[PDB]
Amino acid sequence: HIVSVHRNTENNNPSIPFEFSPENMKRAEEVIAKYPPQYKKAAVMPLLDIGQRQLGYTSISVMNYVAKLLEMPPMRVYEVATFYTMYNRTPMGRYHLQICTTTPCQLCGSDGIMEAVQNTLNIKPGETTKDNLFTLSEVECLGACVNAPMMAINDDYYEDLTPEGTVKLLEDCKAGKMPTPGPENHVRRDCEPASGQKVLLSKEPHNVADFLQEGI
Amino acid sequence: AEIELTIDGHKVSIEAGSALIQACEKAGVTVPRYCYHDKLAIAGNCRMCLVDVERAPKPVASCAYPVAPGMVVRTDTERVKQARENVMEMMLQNHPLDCPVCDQGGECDLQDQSMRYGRDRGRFTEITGKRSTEDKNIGPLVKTSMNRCIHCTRCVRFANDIAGAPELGSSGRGNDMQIGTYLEKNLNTELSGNVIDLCPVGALTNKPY
Amino acid sequence: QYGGLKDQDRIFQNLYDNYGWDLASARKQGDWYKTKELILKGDTWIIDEIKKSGLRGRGGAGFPSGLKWSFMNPPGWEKNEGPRYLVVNADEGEPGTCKDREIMRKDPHKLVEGCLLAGRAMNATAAYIYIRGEFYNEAAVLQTAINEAYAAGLIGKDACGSGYDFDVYIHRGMGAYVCGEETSLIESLEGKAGKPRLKPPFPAGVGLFGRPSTVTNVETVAVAPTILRRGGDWFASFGRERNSGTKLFCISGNVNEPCTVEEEMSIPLRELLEKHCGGIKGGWDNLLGVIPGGCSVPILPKNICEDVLMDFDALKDVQSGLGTAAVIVINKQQDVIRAIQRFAAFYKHESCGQCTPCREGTTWLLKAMDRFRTGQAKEREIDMLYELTKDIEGHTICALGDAAAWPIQGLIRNFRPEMETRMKKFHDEVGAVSVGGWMKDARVEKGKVVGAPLPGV
Amino acid sequence: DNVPAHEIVSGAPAELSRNRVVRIYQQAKPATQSGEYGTFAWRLDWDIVDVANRWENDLIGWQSSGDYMQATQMKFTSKESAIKFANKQGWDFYIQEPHHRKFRVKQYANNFVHSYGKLKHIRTK
Amino acid sequence: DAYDKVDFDVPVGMNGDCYDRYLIRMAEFRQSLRIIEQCCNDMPAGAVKVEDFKINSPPRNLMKEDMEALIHHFLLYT
Amino acid sequence: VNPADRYLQHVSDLHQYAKYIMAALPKYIQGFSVWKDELTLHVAPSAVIPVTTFLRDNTSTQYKSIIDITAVDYPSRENRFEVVYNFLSVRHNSRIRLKTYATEVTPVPSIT
Amino acid sequence: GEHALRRYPSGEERCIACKLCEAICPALAITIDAEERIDGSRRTTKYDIDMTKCIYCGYCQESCPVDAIVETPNVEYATETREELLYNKEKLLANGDKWELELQYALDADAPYR
Amino acid sequence: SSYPTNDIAENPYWKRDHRRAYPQTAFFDQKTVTGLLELGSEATPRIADGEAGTKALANIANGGVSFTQALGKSSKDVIYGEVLTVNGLPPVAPTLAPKQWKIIEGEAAIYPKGYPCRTFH
Ligand SMILES: NC(=O)C1=CN([C@@H]2O[C@H](COP(=O)(O)OP(=O)(O)OC[C@H]3O[C@@H](n4cnc5c(N)ncnc54)[C@H](O)[C@@H]3O)[C@@H](O)[C@H]2O)C=CC1
Ligand SMILES: Cc1cc2nc3c(=O)[nH]c(=O)nc-3n(C[C@H](O)[C@H](O)[C@H](O)COP(=O)(O)O)c2cc1C
Ligand code: SF4
Ligand code: SF4
Ligand code: SF4
Ligand code: SF4
Ligand code: SF4
Ligand code: FES
Ligand code: FES
């Protein structure tokens, strides 16, 4: 579901003060500059993203600070923050496991990936580890269906997965070290048939300039 | 200046740029609605007011379709009736069975237009049941039973535009979209009592009454 | 015969990333060679080359692109002061669609040059590229490339020295597939929840920030500079009439080697599959059906998909559409009803919840699909479900409702026997079911329903 | 103009035409509903009498009344017809002229008008 | 009603006096007994009230489970 | 099935019959109305005796039985009351309705 | 026969002051007042039936959506003065408590036909 | 319940909504019967096209022709076909369901021969 009500706790409470770090500030100036001067409320989404970067999650203090900064009524900021799912309104931890479970993913074993993650971490998809160190999430299409078994950690994609390989990825993450930045145990460079390239077998690309319309 | 069009055979003349529903009202043709109101911005989210215009392939929202010269409008086509039934069927799917206990009862637009345009019976018998919604405290004047909200945004439109009280709004997305303040805040304005009249269903109600 | 595109005829060589995306590599490809003279040429020439090309929006709409950009310029365009605007729909989210990701990651400069070229055609002052948020790394890639273009001076207040002003920005959406809709997109850019507006007014008359704006897919803009350079007639040569050019064809599902390639339009399915993706896992006998285009399009049956053609027209004739050419294949091992139920769950999660038909109908469709996946239903509820789809189809504010209704209708049209077999499995195996999944001893006790499976708890 | 007392052939009490005042009007558009079906007829009903309107029985708590017209209300198709009827009966009346909504042009596109200066308010939808 | 689906005769007097009317009533007794037997033998199955809940109230098992039926019941009785 | 459909041919017959009656007494019949199986003749108060005699007594009508007589108070009309006569023709198995109007001071001719 | 107001097995009243019984009653026998109970429930504060206006038609019982007002099979309640025939809430609840078992018999027998 | 009324998948209520397809009451005044006499009927027209037809309708709807003049101008064909019967006889008071009486005599009668009460079927 989507939780659409905020209940004040001692953490994540309006009285808690949230201010942008000076670097985050300068970045906020730079991002507000892009939109017209009168329409600077259009920058709420990037500003909320900056807040969720500085602090772990999108708290009510972050929402109100952004609302004050763009002189918007906090209710508009609340509508924005609750409308978009990439805004995380509860605190999580260091790594945020996001399994894609749309049909192309399942047709290639995202149930196996899901089981592997759930066996390694007893937690349910919504829950987080008692160490807070991992947080799982079932997610819709992440836009890399060419690699049907795939997953994301915080911002990086990890694709063409295997259950026996998803466990190994997990423990490498648990130790603290990141095994690979590349999406997979290297089997392809990210879009070509596993049998290797079938087209574009030329050492140098043809210039477009050889073909001219004569229109100039 | 004033332009000309035909609605259900009749001939009705209306100022250019007006909405089709204003033309229908002027011409004596009754169109059902929920989200449209004469004093509020046009919203077009209820989809109750659909009509057929010969130029468009699909039925058009009458509250938000601007009039044009020579337009031909039919409010009584079989497609229109089927459309109203479909819209009502969908509207009542998650509506609570609260009429004996709803204060609106006997003066509820959902009742009257379901009786006039909807089907005699229902098709929704799902073992998973209906959606339910938290109740929200917005002060000692306006009692809230948000299970009944049909999401017409009249309350939001009024509170924002007319009374200048922006604490009211819609949070969440899709099925879980809830009218409220997203946190405990009173609907604080001297005109608040009017959302009681604007809310077509019993979601917002006079509390001392 | 259609297909087998020549490597020299391929639009962008960088799909495979061997050459590189550096600005110097794009110069090697020939990008930005002639921008000065293209800008110098009158906007009418750009739009008229497009009209000669027969370009249609490959985001999936198919509305003729040349005419669409024409509406941006009304006769008295000069009178309406204020900034004209252009918007690019980088928010691909259609399940199965990965083409736009390849376009932005592999060939970033072509997009920015096409943005400037189309903006010249539409006299736009600035552009906004709206990227979905999970797309982080290629948002960085694109931003790097746009920085290079600024530093070179090819994009900016002085574009190639022509005296034509253009600014190009990146806006990131955050996890809302409805924002791909052009008007939801405009709203999200403005700083509200991405709830679509009603059309009319169309984006051209009233659009971004109240200003005349146009929303276009990334790859249709991307192909534009190459189209202008190589000429309209050459582009028309590929693909059949009214379906001309070469599109990206992401292929996913139960093929032996999933792929991403570009190919002539109007190629046959069988040839496309066996040549690019090593064929269906198990061979053509082992094919249940194919979804041409993303999840929004009705599924094709095995018998008819043998002879079907990949233009808009043939797929529309067999009662489907190209969409974003995101073919998904399902073999005989896989369950079709499970897939369609997952699509219904996707649309339930993706509805913005503004208009009552979509808002209350996607959840009904999910609730019905779960019971059909277990078989916990009567066989007349199939016809009921069909009518439930028709409740949504024509009555919503935007086409997300159409997309929600369609996959289920395709399922009913092609695989009703499968549903009937699974309902027999529920009846003999578990018990006799009434409408909506109730059973003989299904009752309400102390706050819950006991006595019945209740699919999708 | 007005029928005097004692040539009315109805047989009603004289007090009805002597010291009672009726009111003629059209019902107002209810604020609670958007329907307008009740607002076209011209009602005629009697203004209340102070002493005889309603009191509370001292046994079961009921609403006692001595005004025999408290529940009566006629419907007419038109204002002139109601006037003619009241005159023919000899009833003193008052006309309450109806109020209607002043027409204004409403455009959906007006919600998205570009603003050249500072935004006066954030529309939200 | 079902006076066309049933078989019965009509007694008619000739003198128009109290005695003929008595005979008529006494024979209408018999004809009524005949009709009652025919309806006892031919009572069909199906609904007993018109099946449009906009006219007649819905059965209470619908009224307590279905939204449309509850609305129609409310309005019909108010 | 729509229950009004069973009356279509009979409604046509009643129309033909009413046309004949109007043509026969153009001095008296101000109009008729037909609804399923009930035919109404509208006449002025002075026309009542002639029209009732014609109904009772013509060979093609023979409306021998008076069924009821009543008034309906329409306070919007200038003439408040409309007097209704129902007749029955046992000869032909047919009924007819005849209307007039009156006021609180103008009488109607008695048909006793 | 005579009228009685029913309870839930938990002993909470069933009448929720929906006043449909008041609206349908062809003799205008029923008089009802209501307001928010101290615990927030919608309940009646006055429910009278004038048993000398009632025509014992049973509409009030068909109308109530929670089966709160019912008509017992009791006919033996003749009184010596009229004031005993003006039932208030307390009397009608007492009748319900007293006749609940017989009411359950009649309900078990006829509920499928309502 | 009875099929197809109880169907969950093919009955739209407006297709079986008999209350609101009720027959309107058809009021015919002397002007309308006139118009029928001169200009004929929709089933069998006796009217010219163009402006001529509309102006004929207009001047009958204004009072140009009275009912008596209408009847006088009326030919033999129209009187016999459309006021009287094709044979020239007046129409008989219509009956919805004609009842043909039969008299039962003998053993099947209710009373024996003597009594002054007969059996009609
Ligand atoms: N690219 C993707 O990932 C996805 C795209 N789609 C595609 O979206 C399509 C439907 O999108 P819609 O917006 O409903 O399409 P549509 O048929 O309404 O066309 C959209 C465009 O039409 C233009 N237009 C049409 N008439 C116009 C006029 N008179 N004046 C100015 N502009 C006019 C508008 O500017 C607008 O941008 C489907 O065919 C579907 O395949 C749907 C799902 C995913
Ligand atoms: C729910 C929904 C999602 C959409 N997503 C996209 C999208 O991701 N990318 C896109 O180019 N068009 C998308 N569209 C369609 C665009 O809004 C628009 O109609 C058009 O296809 C884009 O312009 P173009 O294809 O002519 O270049 C979507 C439409 C809907 C209803
Ligand atoms: S809001 Fe209207 S329809 Fe809903 S329970 Fe109340 S009276 Fe009934
Ligand atoms: S509370 Fe009432 S006015 Fe507000 S959205 Fe819900 S139904 Fe509409
Ligand atoms: S159809 Fe669905 S996604 Fe589109 S506006 Fe309506 S509720 Fe939102
Ligand atoms: S039995 Fe009839 S009269 Fe008596 S209370 Fe019930 S509805 Fe009213
Ligand atoms: S109808 Fe039933 S529930 Fe409603 S007020 Fe009357 S007794 Fe109470
Ligand atoms: S199906 Fe998983 S990313 Fe597309
Ligand atoms: S009243 Fe027009 S769509 Fe709601």
TrEMBL record, chain A:
<dbReference type="GO" id="GO:0005743">
    <property type="term" value="C:mitochondrial inner membrane"/>
</dbReference>
<feature type="binding site">
    <location>
        <position position="142"/>
    </location>
    <ligand>
        <name>[2Fe-2S] cluster</name>
    </ligand>
</feature>
<dbReference type="GO" id="GO:1902494">
    <property type="term" value="C:catalytic complex"/>
</dbReference>
<dbReference type="InterPro" id="IPR036249">
    <property type="entry name" value="Thioredoxin-like_sf"/>
</dbReference>
<feature type="binding site">
    <location>
        <position position="100"/>
    </location>
    <ligand>
        <name>[2Fe-2S] cluster</name>
    </ligand>
</feature>
<keyword id="KW-0479">Metal-binding</keyword>
<keyword id="KW-1278">Translocase</keyword>
<keyword id="KW-0560">Oxidoreductase</keyword>
<dbReference type="GO" id="GO:0006120">
    <property type="term" value="P:mitochondrial electron transport, NADH to ubiquinone"/>
</dbReference>
<protein>
    <submittedName>
        <fullName>Subunit NUHM of protein NADH:Ubiquinone oxidoreductase</fullName>
        <ecNumber>1.6.99.3</ecNumber>
    </submittedName>
</protein>
<dbReference type="GO" id="GO:0051537">
    <property type="term" value="F:2 iron, 2 sulfur cluster binding"/>
</dbReference>
<dbReference type="InterPro" id="IPR041921">
    <property type="entry name" value="NuoE_N"/>
</dbReference>
From TrEMBL, chain B:
<feature type="binding site">
    <location>
        <position position="95"/>
    </location>
    <ligand>
        <name>[4Fe-4S] cluster 1</name>
    </ligand>
</feature>
<feature type="binding site">
    <location>
        <position position="35"/>
    </location>
    <ligand>
        <name>[2Fe-2S] cluster 2</name>
    </ligand>
</feature>
<feature type="binding site">
    <location>
        <position position="99"/>
    </location>
    <ligand>
        <name>[4Fe-4S] cluster 2</name>
    </ligand>
</feature>
<feature type="binding site">
    <location>
        <position position="63"/>
    </location>
    <ligand>
        <name>[2Fe-2S] cluster 2</name>
    </ligand>
</feature>
<feature type="binding site">
    <location>
        <position position="49"/>
    </location>
    <ligand>
        <name>[2Fe-2S] cluster 2</name>
    </ligand>
</feature>
<feature type="binding site">
    <location>
        <position position="155"/>
    </location>
    <ligand>
        <name>[4Fe-4S] cluster 3</name>
    </ligand>
</feature>
<feature type="binding site">
    <location>
        <position position="36"/>
    </location>
    <ligand>
        <name>[2Fe-2S] cluster 1</name>
    </ligand>
</feature>
<feature type="binding site">
    <location>
        <position position="63"/>
    </location>
    <ligand>
        <name>[2Fe-2S] cluster 1</name>
    </ligand>
</feature>
<feature type="binding site">
    <location>
        <position position="35"/>
    </location>
    <ligand>
        <name>[2Fe-2S] cluster 1</name>
    </ligand>
</feature>
<comment type="similarity">
    <text>Belongs to the complex I 75 kDa subunit family.</text>
</comment>
<feature type="binding site">
    <location>
        <position position="108"/>
    </location>
    <ligand>
        <name>[4Fe-4S] cluster 2</name>
    </ligand>
</feature>
<feature type="binding site">
    <location>
        <position position="35"/>
    </location>
    <ligand>
        <name>[2Fe-2S] cluster 3</name>
    </ligand>
</feature>
UniProtKB/TrEMBL annotation, chain C:
<dbReference type="GO" id="GO:0016491">
    <property type="term" value="F:oxidoreductase activity"/>
</dbReference>
<comment type="similarity">
    <text>Belongs to the complex I 51 kDa subunit family.</text>
</comment>
<keyword id="KW-0496">Mitochondrion</keyword>
<keyword id="KW-0285">Flavoprotein</keyword>
<keyword id="KW-0408">Iron</keyword>
<protein>
    <recommendedName>
        <fullName>NADH dehydrogenase [ubiquinone] flavoprotein 1, mitochondrial</fullName>
        <ecNumber>7.1.1.2</ecNumber>
    </recommendedName>
</protein>
<dbReference type="InterPro" id="IPR037207">
    <property type="entry name" value="Nuop51_4Fe4S-bd_sf"/>
</dbReference>
<feature type="binding site">
    <location>
        <position position="358"/>
    </location>
    <ligand>
        <name>[4Fe-4S] cluster</name>
    </ligand>
</feature>
<dbReference type="GO" id="GO:0051539">
    <property type="term" value="F:4 iron, 4 sulfur cluster binding"/>
</dbReference>
<feature type="binding site">
    <location>
        <position position="68"/>
    </location>
    <ligand>
        <name>FMN</name>
    </ligand>
</feature>
<keyword id="KW-0472">Membrane</keyword>
<keyword id="KW-0520">NAD</keyword>
TrEMBL record, chain E:
<comment type="similarity">
    <text>Belongs to the complex I 49 kDa subunit family.</text>
</comment>
<protein>
    <submittedName>
        <fullName>NUCM protein</fullName>
    </submittedName>
</protein>
